Design a protein around this ligand. Structure first.
Ligand SMILES: Cc1cc(-c2nc3sc4c(c3c(=O)[nH]2)CCN(C)C4)cc(C)c1O
Length: 124
């Protein structure tokens, strides 16, 4: 058993764009998603199939770019900060679980640099 994936639809929430949320989807997510190091982050960590028996012991808030993509596409987030918080969680999870020398960590770090390059140019 893996946790259910995070919720991605918010049925009773009305649709509202913001400049920031449009930027997060069309610029930030789009750039990260197509990067060559995206693939370990494109879907929830399957701790069963990946054989990480301690993964949910260590990680209390699973998060991934597949979930973030869908939340953005579904206008799940009320604001840009919620979305940014999910990216931060995703990277945090990687850095607190994996060993510092691991390729997955260096991949995360490459992605996070890009995320931050782009979040620095965020609109308001
Ligand atoms: C320990 C750990 C494993 C992974 C990880 N590896 C793979 S390998 C693999 C996947 C896949 C995946 O999700 N996630 C999913 C399907 N294919 C792309 C095979 C990701 C992170 C962030 C992590 O901290």
């Amino acid at each position: 058993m893996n946790p259910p994936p995070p919720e991605t639809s918010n049925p009773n929430k009305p649709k509202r764009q913001t400049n920031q949320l449009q930027y997060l989807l069309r610029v930030v997510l789009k750039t990260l998603w197509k990067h060559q190091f995206a693939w370990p982050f494109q879907q929830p960590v399957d701790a069963v199939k990946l054989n990480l028996p301690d993964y949910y012991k260590i990680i209390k808030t699973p998060m991934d770019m597949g979930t973030i993509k869908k939340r953005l596409e579904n206008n799940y987030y009320w604001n840009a900060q919620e979305c940014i918080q999910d990216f931060n969680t995703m990277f945090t999870n990687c850095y607190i679980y994996n060993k510092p020398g691991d390729d997955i960590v260096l991949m995360a770090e490459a992605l996070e640099k890009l995320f931050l390059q782009k979040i620095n140019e965020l609109p308001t």
